[model samples]
Target chain A: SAVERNIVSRLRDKGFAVVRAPAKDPIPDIIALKNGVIILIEMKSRKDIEGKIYVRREQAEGIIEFARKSGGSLFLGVKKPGVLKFIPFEKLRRTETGNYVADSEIEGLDLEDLVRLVEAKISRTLD
Target chain B: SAVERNIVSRLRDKGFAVVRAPAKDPIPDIIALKNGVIILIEMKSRKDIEGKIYVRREQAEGIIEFARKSGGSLFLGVKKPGVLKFIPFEKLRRTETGNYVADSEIEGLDLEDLVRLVEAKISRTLD
Candidate 1:
């Protein structure tokens, strides 16, 4: 099972609300909310035992549309061993398979160190 | 082409932000954002000139996952002649074809008459 223990636990540690979609839905993996701001997360493991790095074409496309249209923040959270980065939806690219495959995993936020990026987005509308 | 002129035109008229995910993308038809609430709209027609009411197998699963995780809203916007309804994600059912089939369209929103529901959701976090 590609369970996201690290991410889920830490988000709870942040005092945010979390919801997990069913295991096999072709949508984002986690939805975390704090106050009124929500973050739609698509989790990718650089080295999951199952190697679940692929973001289905439908998954990528739908999450993008959901975030951009819903005033919510959409992030691509990639975890490696003990580290993580939260990439903005715009920074991702599509593959022939419709997964969020990029030539390079570009700029992203380390939610471990900071969430100013998500905070900033939430603030823009929270006001 | 399943052009969503009525929904797109009305959301714009309501002064919300709107984006369309190219004609062929496996995502929602309209991404409409007002203030800070983004609404992911999966458009279907009771009878489009082209009769484009089918919710593809992939589209339904992705959007449902996206909304459940993100705290954002996902809607099935079915339009018939001069009427429409914004059905919540839970109200939708899956068909054997993987489309968002329903026993019935069920209770939904009339964006034309009121937005108290949306306004209330946005207000919850704005504080």
Candidate 2:
């Protein structure tokens, strides 16, 4: 259903410069930049919102490492019919075997919510 | 010739935790971490030492953006029969189509050289 392209285009339309890695890349599937803010996202999709999102062990590890190195916020772009939610990577539960999964009902930030939240944080200063 | 695996093993042997993306991923092929230092690399190889290294336009843009966001050094891992050199991503010349290319004679830092150089820079503070 071109979920990756959907994510990229949505971010781009919002004035963010976006890039998407090919499917199955160890790194995050998408990176978006705007106003010095960077977001690294691994895209996941299901036909219905009731399904769980899954990330492979190796892929999750790699993306987490990059998130730490880049100082960028990391997210799981969970897409269901007519919906896309950006859930923080940390929200996923790690399985015994090392993979990560999150249930569909988890709280997630919408793109506009994230943008405003980060911008608010950035504009604050130490007194 | 198992070049990507070779690069991963060599870096790991030096105490760096390394991860390699599958071949043909748009992101840089490798990321390495040691003592809070991070390095991102795209791998290239030639049977002889004479061929030029090439990076696709889209891949180069994606990697450069990540390098900036991550605050990590970006490199091209150039491998020959028995030698592997890490050339700074900026060393590659960009062509009209926006692809990047570099010749074999370009200067590159060995693993040790890069480690020491970055360590030195990071340790200094304003007097």
Best by DockQ: 1
What DockQ does each listed candidate score? 0.12, 0.09
Best by lDDT: 2
> How big is the positional error of residue B82 in model 1, measured in Å on the Cα after superposition?
1.8
Per-candidate TM equals 0.47, 0.56
Cα displacement (angstroms), candidate 2, residue A71, comes to 6.0
Model 2 off-target regions past 4 Å? A11-38, A44-72, A92-106, A115-127, B11-38, B45-72, B91-106, B115-127
Interface RMSD, every prediction, one decimal place: 8.0, 6.2
Residue lDDT tens for model 2, A23-59? 4325577766554456778774332244677787887
For candidate 2 chain B, the 10 contiguous residues with the lowest summed lDDT are: B118-127
Clashes of each: 5, 1
TM-score of chain B taken alone, every candidate: 0.72, 0.77
